[PDB]
Amino acid sequence: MTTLEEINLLVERGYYEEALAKVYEIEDPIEQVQVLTKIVVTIYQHDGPMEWIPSIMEDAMYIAKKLRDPANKAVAYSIIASTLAIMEYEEDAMDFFNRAIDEANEIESPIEKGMVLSTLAYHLAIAGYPDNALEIFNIAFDTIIGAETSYTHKVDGILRIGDLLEKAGDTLPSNEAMDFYKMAFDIFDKLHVNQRAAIVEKKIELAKTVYDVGLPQIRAALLKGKNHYALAIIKKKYSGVMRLIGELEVALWMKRVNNMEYLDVVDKAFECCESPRFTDVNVQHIARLLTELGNLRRALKFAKEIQNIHKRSEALKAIALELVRRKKFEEVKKIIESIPDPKIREEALNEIGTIE
Known about the structure:
By secondary structure, the chain is mainly alpha-helical. It has a single domain (1-356), classed as Serine Threonine Protein Phosphatase 5, Tetratricopeptide repeat. Helix content is 76%, strand content 0%. The chain is built from 20 helices and no strands. The chain has helices spanning 2-12, 16-22, 29-45, 53-65, 70-86, 90-104, 110-126, 130-146, 151-171, 174-190, 194-209, 216-223, 227-237, 240-256, 262-271, 280-293, 296-303, 309-325, 332-338, 342-351. The longest helix has 21 residues, at 151-171. It is classed as unknown function.
């Protein structure tokens, strides 16, 4: 721990050769590989001396080659694999992932095998290979669940897959993160860790609500309630239509965690800029967002501009139902008459027969 501090400091001072010389004062090999690869990654990312990278990866590769114990080797190869994948050496990454797999299949304990697989799956996700990651997480899971030990030994192994599924999810954008979160929740639900199930359930509503702009650092900020920070990222990374939708999705999430400042974000999302140019799908999307937000005035403006006759029918109904719940009937009838699909117009006319 102080050794890691000395190594970091030597790096900050650009004394790379000495830092690497100290890496051997680290006891654990896997830890040596972690350190070595984290140096490479920060160099690659913060434009440090790129010509150190090959020599360091060689050192890491050498440490992994000497390992002997199948589990350790598998993790080491995984660490090497995801860092190559970060740096876009895809053929080499998949080579090391396959080495990791082979070593995993040498493990005797199925619970041990399962554990190693989920780590490797986690590295596949870090690497930007979400589909491969899932496949491996599922094999990891099948490996533990199929084993012939007693209930209790399987339990801790499977909860650890849960934790890793969840962390993989957290590092992914919403569309990719969703499958990881569902598996984790499933695991936490069946295995009776309710505190953990609740958090993941919440990360799913969040990923679902803030979807298009659901960058992992944005979802992370929203979950902490650092709303202005996330909004800030959205202004930096998006403009026009995507910036509008993103701000609305954020307002919607704020609304659902009972933060009443969401009203402000909505007004600003329209009042900040000129109305961009919209595709019909953008129109539909904004109409739905504004409805769930409760801004039925704006939501109606958008719904009436939906060109797809069926989508328009749907959006007009939703708005009208919400009107009913919240009184304000003086516009309901006209809106229903407006629905182009008479079938739908009838369904809305029955649902308004809520006895409530």
